[PDB]
Ligand binder design. Structure first.
Ligand SMILES: *[C@@H]1O[C@H](CO)[C@@H](O[C@@H]2O[C@H](CO)[C@@H](O[C@@H]3O[C@H](CO[C@H]4O[C@H](CO)[C@@H](O)[C@H](O[C@H]5O[C@H](CO)[C@@H](O)[C@H](O)[C@@H]5O[C@H]5O[C@H](CO)[C@@H](O)[C@H](O)[C@@H]5O)[C@@H]4O)[C@@H](O)[C@H](O[C@H]4O[C@H](CO)[C@@H](O)[C@H](O)[C@@H]4O[C@H]4O[C@H](CO)[C@@H](O)[C@H](O)[C@@H]4O)[C@@H]3O)[C@H](O)[C@H]2NC(C)=O)[C@H](O)[C@H]1NC(C)=O
Ligand SMILES: COc1ncccc1-c1cc(Cl)c(C)cc1OCc1n[nH]c(=O)n1C
Ligand SMILES: [Ca+2]
Ligand SMILES: [Cl-]
Ligand code: NA
Ligand code: NA
Ligand SMILES: [Zn+2]
Length: 805
């Protein structure tokens, strides 16, 4: 109950929310049924519209009007935004030349440039070029300021997950808003876009920007606008707050538009009907910039123009139905549309079986337009698993499609022509970023980046210390003219051992054999130097990775490769090798087919053993440095060391062998040499972070050899591919992957074919950032380069997407 008969006189859009059952005059009151009786009359004035006209200039103040053209309006801070244009012969901001903003030019009393976040729903990245003729204000921001060709959203590419990621710097699995709809079984409560539970604070984790600012003594305006407040009134309210006294005035503000998303759903991303919502958004931008210019703030405020996600063509006839696959459709609940999430209709049914649901959905029709996953098997780049609100069973839906439970669900709800929510690497889901102001660079283009990075930068723009988040702070320093954050490299926690020859062959009883006793001063001194690190400058181009946790490991040098060997996990944590453009692929010789050789630098007690693999009928093994790429018949023996072996399901070895035998050489030819770092990942609790030894759920049968959940590779070369990877003077180029270590290839519907028709497709799906691998391994790469650390941070956040242009 709200005693809604107090008054909003003098309180309109008050910044603090007052205590119930007293009535509220803040923006949110509309959303909560809680506004005072006179809110509309006082706070949502509309008389005479939003623009000054020649006849209103100098008019007698009339407090009924939406905005004012009276002589006193500037000092009252409540002029219509085109006041100076219509009445004082001023130009619109969009008609002025741009001029570099080298320093903030702010009114007396401003302690820091304010930040205004102008957020637009469904603003697909290509609108910037395609709609440029109808968006002159936006185009001036973009061309004069700092812009990316696009910004990558988070998955699922829906409004609530993305805006709350913008606010917090966190992945949806960590902030808790994992979809536009949700069930939380600890709460036993549901979350819906329309409705009231969504306002309960227990949905919303992390620490959003407005809370970060408030805790650190910086005041914040409204971020969440009640839907029925018109855009013009949102703009005027921001401008009025900017005229408050210094002690009362917020330093951070947000505007939000539900367009162009609302129209895109109805008409498709490029429907002829889309031109008008883009003109209208541009007009709102012009209103803000004219308002800033009147307040003399237009060379003082930093403005961020940002989208939450794009928009794809999607119609009702592109709907797959679970009822075409499942006979038990009534025992399940599906969250439908551009992704699928499945759980049991009833937790009292112990015959509900996730395993047979998945199998019933897997490669069942020849052009099937979605793919089922246990959430832990989703591409690690999605970071979409470590939350009780994400259902164990997930469906990744093809772009342009929907999934629904039953046909009745689609027609008892064709209306829509657009939708979004798909995989965040899809081109149509990409959105926009422009930064304009004294703290941003002038006429500068930056490479695409992920929206999880913006929270750090907004904190930098406001002099705030960010709460812990998933951005990599410093990776966006190149956007900024000043206020950069000067990150330092994390310190190494464990230093390596450098073991020499310490064991005789007969001390090993690992059940391994190798046909290797096949018998010189020229090349006995030569191979001693190789074991000592003579070729390490070739194979370890960017320094050794730092180990950032406490552990016991050895560095092992070889002619063709260097590794960091873990005495705890009995395998390398990383293996580094460089393949030049000229390098040759050879085969594994016959007499060496099943060869595994004890490593006399490493004790039997810290080694894997072959018997375990023999005994384990499901588990085979592979090698981190591929024998196929050995530099000489004699160097090839190093590749069969027991210290280069890792456990691999036979199904996975099909993938790995193809990568090693074909793809590495292909990349080396195309990129002019590559450096490769490969290794295992253990993420049994699917949190995106390295497992400790006591978290491992699977071992090679009868042994202490832990089984990786994934295998990674980081492939680095020169960005200027006229220089070979091992002799690169300038910026680097990288691509990486984190391949799931699975006992079948059910994920790949064409796997019964030759690896050349499916393997590279699978690796592309599992593309990764170097940063994703760092989290999963506790390693820190690129420690010794000639590049600035900010540049290296940007390189480590790069994702190679395999989308076209
Ligand atoms: C992306 O960035 C984020 C932020 O940096 C990273 O997430 C952090 O990960 C840390 C490690 O996993 C984690 O640290 C833990 O904190 C626990 C205290 O947690 C509360 O307080 C924080 C801080 O204010 C708060 O943010 C948390 O909020 C979570 O919980 C509620 C749900 O109830 C949500 O509203 C909210 O959205 C958020 O949920 C998310 O995180 C939790 C994990 O905390 C997940 O379970 C959810 O699915 C969701 O994603 C909390 O309210 C603390 O309890 C932990 O301590 C244990 O582990 C330490 C190791 O130091 C051990 O020594 C201790 O003994 C302790 O173990 C004891 O408890 C165990 C579990 O009950 C028990 O098994 C043992 O036997 C012991 O008795 C731990 O330090 C931190 O909370 C999150 N922060 C956030 C915001 O998510 C994330 O890792 C990054 N991702 C990537 C890929 O890099
Ligand atoms: C789902 O976003 C939110 N949820 C809860 C708190 C705040 C935000 C939020 C956060 C940011 Cl960073 C921005 C830039 C806009 C936001 O909300 C805008 C909004 N107003 N009205 C409406 O419907 N939306 C989505
Ligand atoms: Ca883990
Ligand atoms: Cl959703
Ligand atoms: Na075996
Ligand atoms: Na298959
Ligand atoms: Zn939408």
């Amino acid at each position: 109950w709200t005693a809604t008969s107090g008054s909003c006189k003098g309180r309109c859009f008050e910044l603090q929310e007052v205590g119930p059952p007293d009535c509220r005059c803040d923006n949110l009151c509309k959303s909560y049924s809680s506004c005072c009786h006179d809110f509309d009359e006082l706070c949502l004035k509309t008389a005479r519209g939003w623009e000054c006209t020649k006849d209103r200039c100098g008019e007698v103040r009339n407090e009924e009007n939406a905005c004012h053209c009276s002589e006193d309006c500037l000092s009252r801070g409540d002029c219509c935004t085109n006041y100076q244009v219509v009445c004082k012969g001023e130009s619109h901001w969009v008609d002025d030349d741009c001029e570099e903003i080298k320093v903030p030019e702010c009114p007396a009393g401003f302690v820091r440039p304010p930040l205004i976040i102008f957020s637009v729903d469904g603003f697909r990245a290509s609108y910037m070029k395609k709609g440029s003729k109808v968006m002159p204000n936006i185009e001036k921001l973009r061309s004069c300021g700092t812009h990316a060709p696009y910004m990558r959203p988070v998955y699922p590419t829906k409004t609530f997950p993305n805006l709350y990621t913008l606010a917090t710097g966190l992945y949806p699995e960590s902030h808790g808003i994992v979809g536009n709809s949700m069930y939380d079984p600890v709460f036993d409560a549901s979350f819906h876009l329309r409705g009231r539970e969504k306002f309960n604070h227990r949905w919303w984790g992390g620490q959003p920007l407005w809370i970060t600012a408030t805790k650190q003594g910086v005041r914040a305006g409204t971020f969440f606008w009640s839907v029925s407040i018109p855009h013009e009134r949102r703009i005027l309210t921001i401008l009025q707050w900017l005229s408050l006294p210094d002690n009362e005035r917020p330093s951070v503000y947000a505007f939000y538009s539900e367009q162009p998303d609302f129209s895109g759903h109805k008409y498709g991303p490029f429907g002829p009907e889309m031109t008008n919502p883009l003109r209208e958004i541009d007009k709102t931008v012009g209103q803000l910039m004219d308002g800033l210019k009147q307040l003399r703030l237009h060379r003082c405020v930093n403005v961020i123009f940002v989208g939450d996600h794009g928009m794809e063509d999607v119609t009702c006839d592109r709907t797959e139905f679970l009822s075409n696959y499942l006979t038990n459709v009534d025992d399940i609940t599906l969250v439908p549309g551009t992704l699928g999430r499945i759980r049991a209709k009833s937790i009292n049914n112990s015959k509900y079986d996730p395993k047979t649901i998945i199998a019933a959905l897997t490669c069942k029709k020849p052009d099937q337009h979605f793919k089922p996953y246990m959430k832990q098997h989703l591409p690690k780049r999605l970071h979409y698993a470590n939350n009780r609100r994400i259902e164990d069973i997930h469906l990744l839906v093809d772009r342009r499609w929907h999934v629904a439970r039953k046909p009745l669900d689609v027609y008892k709800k064709c209306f829509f022509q657009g939708d979004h929510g798909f995989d965040n690497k899809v081109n149509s889901m990409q959105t926009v970023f422009v930064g304009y102001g004294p703290t941003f660079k002038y006429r500068t283009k930056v490479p695409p980046f992920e929206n999880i990075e913006l929270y750090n930068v907004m904190c930098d723009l406001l002099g705030l210390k960010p709460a812990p988040n998933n951005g990599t702070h410093g990776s966006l320093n190149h956007l900024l003219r000043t206020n950069t954050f000067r990150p330092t490299m994390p310190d190494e926690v464990s230093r390596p051992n450098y073991p020499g020859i310490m064991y005789l062959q007969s001390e090993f009883d690992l059940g391994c054999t190798c046909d290797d006793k096949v018998e010189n001063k020229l090349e006995e001194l030569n191979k001693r130097l190789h074991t000592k690190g003579s070729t390490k400058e070739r194979h370890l181009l960017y320094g050794r990775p730092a180990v950032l946790y406490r552990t016991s490991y050895d560095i092992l040098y070889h002619t063709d490769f260097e590794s960091g060997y873990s005495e705890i996990f009995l395998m390398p944590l990383w293996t580094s090798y460089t393949i030049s453009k000229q390098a040759e692929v050879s085969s594994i010789p016959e007499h060496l087919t099943n060869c595994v050789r004890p490593d006399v630098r490493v004790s039997p007690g810290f080694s894997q053993n072959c018997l375990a693999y023999k005994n384990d009928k499901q588990m085979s093994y592979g090698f981190l440095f591929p024998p196929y790429l050995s530099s000489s018949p004699e160097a090839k023996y190093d590749a069969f060391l027991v210290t280069n072996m890792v456990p691999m399901y036979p199904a996975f070895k099909r993938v790995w062998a193809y990568f090693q035998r074909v793809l590495v050489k292909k990349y080396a030819s195309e990129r002019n040499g590559v450096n490769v770092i490969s290794g295992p990942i253990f993420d049994y609790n699917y949190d995106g972070l390295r497992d400790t030894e006591d978290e491992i759920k699977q071992y090679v049968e009868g042994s202490s050899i832990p089984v990786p959940t994934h295998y990674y590779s980081i492939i680095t070369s020169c960005l200027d591919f006229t220089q070979p990877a091992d002799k690169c003077d300038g910026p680097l180029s990288v691509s990486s992957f984190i391949l799931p270590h699975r006992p079948d290839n059910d994920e790949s519907c064409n796997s019964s074919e030759d690896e050349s028709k499916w393997v590279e497709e699978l690796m592309k799906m599992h593309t990764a950032r170097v940063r994703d691998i760092e989290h999963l391994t506790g390693l820190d790469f690129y420690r010794k380069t000639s590049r600035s650390y900010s540049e290296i941070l940007t390189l480590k956040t790069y994702l190679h997407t395999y989308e076209s242009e």
